Amino acid sequence: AAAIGIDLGTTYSCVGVFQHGKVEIIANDQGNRTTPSYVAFTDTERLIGDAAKNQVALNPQNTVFDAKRLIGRKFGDPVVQSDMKHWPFQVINDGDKPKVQVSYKGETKAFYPEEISSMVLTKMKEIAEAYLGYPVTNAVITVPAYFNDSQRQATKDAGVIAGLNVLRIINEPTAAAIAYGLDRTGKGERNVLIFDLGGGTFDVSILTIDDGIFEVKATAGDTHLGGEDFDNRLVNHFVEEFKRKHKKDISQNKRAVRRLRTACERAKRTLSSSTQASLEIDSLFEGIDFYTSITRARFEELCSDLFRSTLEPVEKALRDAKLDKAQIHDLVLVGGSTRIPKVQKLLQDFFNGRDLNKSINPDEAVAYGAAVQAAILMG
Ligand SMILES: [Cl-]
Ligand SMILES: [Mg+2]
Ligand SMILES: [Mg+2]
Ligand code: NA
């Protein structure tokens, strides 16, 4: 039995397995190689993954996401106090530990963050088992390099709840470096910068690698900058466009806004490979359909400050690591938003034309590395 590698991500998760001499990133039942980190509770069912995200506009108070922002934290942590203000589900305090409180089968129930993440992990484990054809019992699970002992412990506990023996909790930028084989280097220090622009967070890490030993030299970023912020710029643009065209403001209709948001995420993805995207929503508001388009250049304008902002954490990490640009051996892209051509241009330009390691789909690199490491640990 192979062990699996799981990237338990803030917004999406991904699972890989090393077998027959290579990594398989595993597609779920819908054919998607990443799965939303969402769990929903209804009057009759518990939904996880695509099925949960697919009904988030219908059921916002009982559809849980962003559990990774709570996991391992005390209730009175200022992060928890701040983040809770912008979620539609309830967070409660049980002995200075946060729980998420929902309605399920008609009864109010509350769950620790590690229970919610265990449900996502169970989904990822079941995606792997369906592909492998046998039960999986061993996994490597990744976490951000900044996670503390409690956050690591809670993630490990999520895995155990899901039925996994957690071989190791490893850092996300480490896993991304392992995916590209950068752990194989011999004696002599190499400096690797991981530029990880995810759905909800932006992490820059500088690692040294010397004869397969990793050290974290610097971390920088913004825990509230990610692809969803670019989607939000598109949403606001289209709310204004709908207003100008129909003389109706859709912005306080939470369902309309959530549905436009999901369509802007699709459009954003399309714009990484095409120079325009068509956006066509049935019955967006008061039975009015919204068919329009946006160009890549217009999208870039709408996001220009946010894209530029990704370079200051690179500068800060370099300062903290006491390195010049020229001393970085490898640049590794992680996170779906690193597919955006303007973001690649900004980073490569800042590095004076250096190559970017970008051949592994950047949504999958962390899982890919976790899978390699899980197989090493097995063996
Ligand atoms: Cl699935
Ligand atoms: Mg990630
Ligand atoms: Mg993220
Ligand atoms: Na993060």
Please tell me the distance from the alpha carbon of residue 94 to that of residue 256, in angstroms, as a whole number.
35
CA-wise closest residue to 227 among 363, 120, 332: 363
Contact between 46 and 38 under an 8 Å Cβ cutoff? The reply is no
Contact between 213 and 192 under an 8 Å Cβ cutoff? The reply is no
Cα 143 to averaged position of ligand 4 atoms, centre (Å):
8
7 is catalytic: yes
Bridge partners for 290 per DSSP: 281
Helix H or strand E encompassing 292: strand 288-295
- 200 assigned to a ligand binding site: yes
72's torsion region: left (phi>0), alpha (psi -120 to 50) or beta? left
Please tell me the distance from the alpha carbon of residue 341 to that of residue 350, in angstroms, as a whole number.
14
Please tell me the distance from the alpha carbon of residue 236 to that of residue 93, in angstroms, as a whole number.
34
Bridge partners for 98 per DSSP: 93
Instruction: Quickly list DSSP for 109-126.
Output: EEE-HHHHHHHHHHHHHH
Half-sphere exposure of 168 toward its Cβ, with a 13 Å CA cutoff?
Answer: 16
Contact between 121 and 151 under an 8 Å Cβ cutoff? The reply is no
Cα 48 to averaged position of ligand 1 atoms, centre (Å):
8
Task: Indicate which residue of 196, 203, 363, 364 is catalytic.
Answer: 196
For the chain, which domains are there?
A: 1-64+120-184+358-379 (3.30.420.40), 65-119 (3.30.30.30), 185-226+310-357 (3.30.420.40), 227-309 (3.90.640.10)
Half-sphere exposure of 363 toward its Cβ, with a 13 Å CA cutoff?
Answer: 21
Contact between 181 and 197 under an 8 Å Cβ cutoff? The reply is no
Please tell me the distance from the alpha carbon of residue 99 to that of residue 55, in angstroms, as a whole number.
22
Identify which ligand lies nearest to the alpha carbon of 229: 3
Angle between helix 311-321 and 341-350 (nearest 10): 30
- 13 assigned to a ligand binding site: no
This entry's atomic model was obtained through X-ray
Cα 335 to averaged position of ligand 3 atoms, centre (Å):
8
129 is catalytic: no
Contact between 310 and 342 under an 8 Å Cβ cutoff? The reply is no
Residues at Cβ < 5 Å from ligand 4 ion: 144, 201, 203
Identify which ligand lies nearest to the alpha carbon of 203: 4
Contact between 61 and 72 under an 8 Å Cβ cutoff? The reply is no
| Single-letter code of the amino acid located at 332 | V
- 272 assigned to a ligand binding site: yes
Please tell me the distance from the alpha carbon of residue 90 to that of residue 259, in angstroms, as a whole number.
22
Please tell me the distance from the alpha carbon of residue 359 to that of residue 35, in angstroms, as a whole number.
21
Identify which ligand lies nearest to the alpha carbon of 35: 1
Tell me the two tokens of residue 92: 């409660």
